[model samples]
Target: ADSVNGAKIFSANCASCHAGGKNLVQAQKTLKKADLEKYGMYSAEAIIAQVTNGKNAMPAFKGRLKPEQIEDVAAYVLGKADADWK
Candidate 1:
């Protein structure tokens, strides 16, 4: 996959809520594959949708972020999860 400046995006918008793949808002849940599975976030599309609309405790980024940027964030998250999924 092509890099999408994902790291920078995460630092700016997501680092506070999610760091080191852990979800500070939901201590029991995380960005890991298992938690994503439980949340029914099984695809890039799912992540994209959630990021756009918000879910659970996460706030929506639809209006604040550009569509391409949101997609990049989704890809970034999936890439991170795949790297540390185990």
Candidate 2:
């Protein structure tokens, strides 16, 4: 996946609520690896599904972003999660 593009897309679309992997709306539901694992959102497929369909407060991106873009975003999220968002 294109991480550069993912980062750009994330900044434009997700930074408002998930900046630096921290969930501003749901503090405990951060994008950190631990949080993801605890919430059962630790995989690319799960992340992709949530981002595509939306869940709770998170709006769906199916119409907002392309499938490949969502896949790239999922990769970016997993990579960032593994890195602890630096």
Candidate 3:
């Protein structure tokens, strides 16, 4: 996995709110571990599912990203700052 690539993907897509510890939808501040776990499990599989199919305010990325890209992004989200998908 390439976490750097994942970061780029996130920046292009999810960073609108998930970055800088902000929640875009609810306008909340910070993306705590508990918050992620509460909304959805932080596992790679869960993240991939959400990204590929989308949930709630998020749009599906099934066609936007390839399977490998999805895996990379999922690893990055679940691993967070310490993630190194590469």
Candidate 4:
């Protein structure tokens, strides 16, 4: 996945509620390393699935974003989580 593209996509689509990996909508369900691990969302697969399907308050990106775009974002999410979104 393209890291640059993913960062742009994330900023456009996810930053509002998830800036810096912090979940504004659901603070406890953040994208931080610990929170992702605790909620079983630490993998690219899980993040991809959630982004594609959506969960509860989160809106699905299936139609809005292309498959490759989702993959990029998934990878981006994992990379950010690894760095604690710093």
Tell me the tens digit of each residue's lDDT in model 4 across 23-82: 888778888888888889988889999999999998899989999999999988888888
How much is 55 displaced in model 3, in angstroms? Answer: 0.6
**Best by TM-score, which number?**
4
Local error of candidate 4 at 56, Å?
A: 0.2
Give the lDDT of residue 49 in candidate 3.
Answer: 90
Backbone clashes in candidate 2 total 0
Cα displacement (angstroms), candidate 3, residue 57, comes to 1.1
RMSD of each: 1.7, 1.3, 3.9, 1.2
> Candidate 3, which ten residues in sequence have the lowest lDDT sum?
77-86
lDDT, candidate 3, equals: 0.71
Candidate 1 accuracy as lDDT: 0.81
All candidates' TM-scores? 0.87, 0.92, 0.77, 0.94
lDDT of 4: 0.89
Tens-place lDDT per residue, model 1, 1-86, is 22367766778999897888888898867888788888788578998898899987998999898888888888888887877753
Error of 4 at 2 (Å): 1.8
lDDT of 3 by residue, 1-86 (tens): 77778877888888876766467777532355566666665577777898899877777999999988888887777667333311
Residue 69 miss distance in model 3 (angstroms): 1.1
- The lDDT per prediction is 0.81, 0.89, 0.71, 0.89
- Per-residue lDDT of model 2, residues 1-86, tens digit only: 88778887898899999998998887888899988999999998999999999999988999899999998898889888898663
